[PDB]
Write a protein that binds this ligand. Structure first.
Ligand SMILES: [Ca+2]
Lengths: 25, 152, 151, 25, 152, 151, 25, 25
């Protein structure tokens, strides 16, 4: 349960940060 | 000559009621040893848990980082860019991640006996002297086995 | 230390009392060795049983791992070469390989964490290998001394 | 013998399931 | 009383000439035990060398198979075909090699002491008992050490 | 066997001659502990020297490996992103990675083969760890007996 | 020395066998 | 500190050697 709660938020956080960095350029 | 002399000595000191004396002395020496063992054991258990939490946390963090890298690449090669332009970026990101894992390994550096020796070496923590705990466990095991023989 | 010298005098008395020191001691040595082996038998049986029960598990688990790897290979091979061309399914195979490596890593982390957490909990709440090993030592020393006495 | 009987059915099963899933879409 | 008895027995049997007698008895006991140990070392050395030949040969065969595959891929990827058609074959050949290596590592199945114990359990050949060998090594070690203390 | 029972009598005699049974025995145990430790020190010196001379080697070897891998990384990145395109440098990078992995495995097998050959040859031609080990065990038992005697 | 004598013949053997198999089709 | 001083020079050295080898052809 905790495994899913660790991975999935990390993946979504990675997506949003890449979104924002691409926005930044 | 000396045979009758050791016979007289046996009659004097070794009253020959020594069997039950051996039983009771054994079953109290065992308790004294266990009481002597418990502090060493609690030190070992605390040390093991403190060296376990670290590895657990580090492993979970490593999994989180792999997932974040996955997310960064999957949001790049399917929304912002095309696959072909981000093909070499992914290969070199994978290469760089492998190199960083290798660098982490190089920077961080009977099976139970090996684990305990390395833990004591990494500790230099007094109060738990591994060889003392080992000879203690060995003496206790031998004594308890002799008690099993005595009770029969 | 009175008990110590008492046991010492008893040992000395038994040693001087023996007749045929080189013969009768060899007989008693055989009896003692036989008795210790008969005592060891249950410990060895328990160890063998526990080893087998903990080994067939790992064999089945690795076999399942191989089956799953082959299943994934089959999925990729048909998709790449029958349904869609390779040019459109290059990213899918890369990211599925990534997902598979992460799942393998996640399985190792789960088994390690679960096993070690279960062990520490059992140790904090609480087949003794130590007496079995001490028994092997005593019996090997006895057999060696018997060998030396025989020839 | 058992090795072949474990791998090959798995590979064929993977192919057929991928077939069916692609059919499904 | 009994103290005077053991004093008389000390003068009787414990002649007290046992100092030099102990030195010479020990320097011969050590040779005796070493002569006893030798066959065990021969058996262990032979067994370990036979189990090492096999590992070397298998690792060399592995390297040979690795290089042959690399050769085949290179020739097709630059002479007989183009890179476009040989990307999926390359990836799937790498996948197949990984699966085969894993199938091999599954069909095969204090650090030195663990290794020796596993080797003995796997090979299980009579004439060499690791336990008697260990206890003999430890007894001869303690005797050499005591002899060092005596020579001073 | 007569010498053995004589040694039993000798132990008995050293036991009976004691004055201040627990005090002088505690003193003698302290001297024994001191003597064994003074003897143990040279072995620990040898072990620490050997461990360090065997640890720095692996550290430097791993650093060299990491540096070489970084050099290859840099080579591939510059050839891929500036001079050429990824379309033309795909097979080159794949086969260079293959070659690097094969060379690493070849280096491992070569050091393994050389090490085992040298070790078996030296063993056939021929810091005693086992006397160090029995020294640690004996000195620990003595320190433990001293503690139990203290209180 | 032996390392070279193991790898290089293997690579050449791989090339020739791939040659022959392509010839075969 | 030493980690950076090991990696970065290696990467730059790799770049320059690839430069020179491409120059060579
Ligand atoms: Ca490609």
């Amino acid at each position: 349960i905790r495994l899913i709660l660790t991975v999935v938020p990390g993946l979504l956080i990675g997506a949003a940060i890449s979104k924002n960095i691409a926005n930044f350029l």
